[PDB]
């Protein structure tokens, strides 16, 4: 299929192996035929004396056999020759894939290496700035509100996001950076036990991504409930918002894992072979971000109505409206909507590499921006930090 080239290669290589052992068992007993058909690990030659260039077809187990089907691999033997003292030796220059495709793979290797360090910096500066922000919202006793409660669950939701991605990137730079030994050093790699630590980290990632978009939505739904309501809320439905944020991802991640374990089983669960099974996680992401965009429109068209009045001593209405709308984009995660409707299926060329850079830049710095715009620059937080900075210095030094 797609995303499982290695296991399918290894399966049909074992099939080619015992197939040509069985077809080498057929051969009649020989006169001359001095070197007589030693099965190399690559392919298998018949009995050949005086064989300066012996020709068989390229083997059919290769992942690019459709392009090397009409070519011949060469080997010469008394005994089979060892040229550079590598004890098997042959001319495998015909069956080898071309240089243009390996150059294109080198270019995309540089691309994926440049993207992967771009958000590793992004998730690190967010994961550090949020744990410092959780220490402020936890320790400083004036800041305990219902508003700072859904902030602190959002801040603990980017921490679950940014840590779960840095684990699964570490478990792919561990798994695909080993060496290749014998077949028992490969059959111990293509086993369900050696990947069971990686499949748990895949579900731990996909829960952490959807629990981000559910907690962006909650703070989209909380701030929308607080406007248009004439009073403070009576009951303060924090048991209802905490169930949408952490429980509604389990309504979509759990029907993913019990499908990804049954029908579509590959090495780690990070490869989407079937699109339809991948729509049951974009569905709580499209429906979350779209709702956030709807809330964004209705807050800003309310935020202008609070600036049409008291307008003469404001006199400009430009700088702070551009400040108040750019400080709300990170909180509602409205940046994702720009390339939302270009889905995974339709993005093909450099639009595909442009979608994976505009989102992955901003969604990695988003945990940094909400700790800065809503904890480190909140003027009530800076009021309480400036109070506890004075009572420490006046109480100890003076």
């Amino acid at each position: 299929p797609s995303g499982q080239v290695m296991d399918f290669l290894f399966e049909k290589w074992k099939l080619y192996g015992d197939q040509c052992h069985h077809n080498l068992s057929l051969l009649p007993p020989p006169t001359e035929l001095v070197c007589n058909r030693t099965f190399d690990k690559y392919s298998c030659w018949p009995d050949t004396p005086a064989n300066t260039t012996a020709n068989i077809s390229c083997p059919w187990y290769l992942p690019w056999h459709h392009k090397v089907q009409h070519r011949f691999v060469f080997k010469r033997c008394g005994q089979w020759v060892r040229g550079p003292r590598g004890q098997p030796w042959r001319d495998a220059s015909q069956c080898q894939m071309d240089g243009e495709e390996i150059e294109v793979q080198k270019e995309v290797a540089k691309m994926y290496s440049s993207f992967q360090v771009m958000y590793t910096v992004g998730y690190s500066l967010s994961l550090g700035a949020l744990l410092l922000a959780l220490a402020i919202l936890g320790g400083l006793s004036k800041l305990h509100c219902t508003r700072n409660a859904i902030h602190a669950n959002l801040f603990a939701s980017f921490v679950l996001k940014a840590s779960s991605v840095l684990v699964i990137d570490g478990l792919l730079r561990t798994r695909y950076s080993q060496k290749i030994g014998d077949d028992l050093s490969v059959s111990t790699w293509l086993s369900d036990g050696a990947v069971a630590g990686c499949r748990v980290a895949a579900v731990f990632m996909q829960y952490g991504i959807v629990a981000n978009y559910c907690w962006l939505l909650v703070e989209g739904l909380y701030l929308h409930n607080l406007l248009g309501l004439a009073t403070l809320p009576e009951r303060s439905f924090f048991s209802l918002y905490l169930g949408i944020g952490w429980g509604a991802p389990m309504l979509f991640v759990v029907p993913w894992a019990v499908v990804k374990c049954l029908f579509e089983n590959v090495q780690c669960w990070t490869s989407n072979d079937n699109m339809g099974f991948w729509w049951i996680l974009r569905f709580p992401v499209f429906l979350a971000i779209l709702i956030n965009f709807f809330i964004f429109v209705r807050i800003v068209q309310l935020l202008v109505a609070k600036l049409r009045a008291r307008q003469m001593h404001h006199t400009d209405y430009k700088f702070r409206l551009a400040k108040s709308t750019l400080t709300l984009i990170p909180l509602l995660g409205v940046h994702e909507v720009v390339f939302a409707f270009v889905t995974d299926e339709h993005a093909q060329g450099t639009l595909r590499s442009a979608k994976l850079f505009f989102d992955l830049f901003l969604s990695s710095f988003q945990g940094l921006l909400v700790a800065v715009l809503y904890c480190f620059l909140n003027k009530e937080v800076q009021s309480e930090l400036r109070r506890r900075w004075h009572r420490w210095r006046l109480g100890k030094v003076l």
Partner: peptide, 29 residues
């Protein structure tokens, strides 16, 4: 989302390169 599809493209790339390195092991050994 965009994290999951970047991870899927990168995992397909790593799997294809591991297959190519396995074929390079078969032609080296």
């Amino acid at each position: 989302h965009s994290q999951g599809t970047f991870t899927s493209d990168y995992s397909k790339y790593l799997d294809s390169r591991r297959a190519e390195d396995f074929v390079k092991w078969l032609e080296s050994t």
